[PDB]
Design a protein around this ligand. Structure first.
Ligand SMILES: *CCC(=O)Nc1cc(Nc2nccc(-c3cn(C)c4ccccc34)n2)c(OC)cc1N(C)CCN(C)C
Ligand SMILES: O=C1c2ccccc2Nc2ccc(F)cc2N1Cc1ccccc1
Length: 293
């Protein structure tokens, strides 16, 4: 639907603060200023790194139309685009930030109910992408945004068209990207969460990752994970892509674990850590998260 993607004028928005910058461009916290109005609406703005040609822009715009067409409570959707010399893209601002920073910031103060529910929601969002037959190619804890502590959303999918330590072996060797290679990255993403944001294969050169994987080496069991959870992660990292679980199977398996969370994650002081109440859930949703879930 063409109406799902707004073409913006440069006067409609202003960048206020950098959220971070890489080789992929700069992402700013911004304000949307509707023409004729006095309101300033917080948004996220992405400025690409290189200036692009009109023909390059058309291809960017074609993909932007697809990314604006996703409609799922656990997937972020692209909202708008501004076609200057460098292209700027607009999406909803998530004030809580990304899930990677969140688990590092709340290290050891996150209960098992949150961690397992995040795994369900990420798998639900990935299952939606598969049903829309869109391959993410860069699923990681940095690309899961926190709408509320109870509600996370996948972002940055489809943009790669390299995160070696998140990629399936077939992607490293043959640059093959499928939904099953997304399942591999999902397993690494869950490992990031269960380790509260540790770096996978920390200290190991990226050039050597393909070698250790062929020998059967995998990421180690997180201390808080029971073998039931680690076994699921290990199945995600099988060489045979068709033997890896499917996302809808991951939804079901983590859902049952989420209804008995202390049986599947061993966390010191779990019986203290705040579980979300209906009171806190109604307040969060009425305030900043009114979408259907
Ligand atoms: C994982 C790093 C991160 O995302 N940090 C933050 C994210 C915020 N909200 C938000 N909303 C929509 C889109 C993005 C976004 C998308 N891409 C590709 C990004 C790259 C770098 C930074 C943000 C990106 N982000 C946010 O709103 C206030 C703040 C942060 N930070 C950096 C707070 C610092 N602290 C959490 C460590
Ligand atoms: O860059 C992109 C992006 C750009 C082109 C094609 C796909 C892309 N994937 C994507 C999917 C959903 C979403 F919600 C945001 C993105 N993004 C990240 C972005 C966009 C605007 C502002 C900040 C960040």
């Amino acid at each position: 639907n063409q109406a799902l993607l707004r073409i913006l004028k440069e006067t409609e928005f202003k960048k206020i603060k950098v959220l971070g910058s890489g080789a992929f461009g700069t992402v700013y916290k911004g304000l949307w200023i509707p023409e004729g109005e006095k309101v300033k609406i917080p948004v996220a703005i992405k400025e690409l790194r290189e200036a692009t040609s009109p023909k390059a822009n058309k291809e960017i715009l074609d993909e932007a139309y697809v990314m604006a067409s996703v409609d799922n409570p656990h997937v972020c959707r692209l909202l708008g685009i501004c076609l200057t010399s460098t292209v700027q893209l607009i999406m909803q601002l998530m004030p809580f930030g990304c899930l990677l920073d969140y688990v590092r910031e709340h290290k050891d103060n996150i209960g098992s109910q949150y961690l397992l529910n995040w795994c369900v929601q990420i798998a639900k969002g990935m299952n939606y992408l598969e049903d829309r037959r869109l391959v993410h190619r860069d699923l990681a804890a940095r690309n899961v945004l926190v709408k509320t502590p109870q509600h996370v959303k996948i972002t940055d999918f489809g943009l790669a068209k390299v995160p070696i330590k998140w990629m399936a072996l077939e992607s490293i060797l043959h640059r093959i990207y499928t939904h099953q290679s997304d399942v591999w990255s999902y397993g690494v993403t869950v490992w990031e969460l269960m380790t509260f944001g540790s770096k996978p294969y920390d200290g190991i050169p990226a050039s050597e990752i393909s070698s250790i994987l062929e020998k059967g080496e995998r990421l180690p069991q997180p201390p808080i994970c029971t073998i039931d959870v680690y076994m699921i992660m290990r199945k995600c990292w099988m060489i045979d892509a068709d033997s890896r679980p499917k996302f809808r199977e991951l939804i079901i398996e983590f859902s049952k674990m989420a209804r008995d969370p202390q049986r599947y994650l061993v966390i010191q002081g779990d019986e203290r850590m705040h579980l979300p109440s209906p009171t806190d859930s109604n307040f969060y949703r009425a305030l900043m998260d009114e979408e259907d879930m």
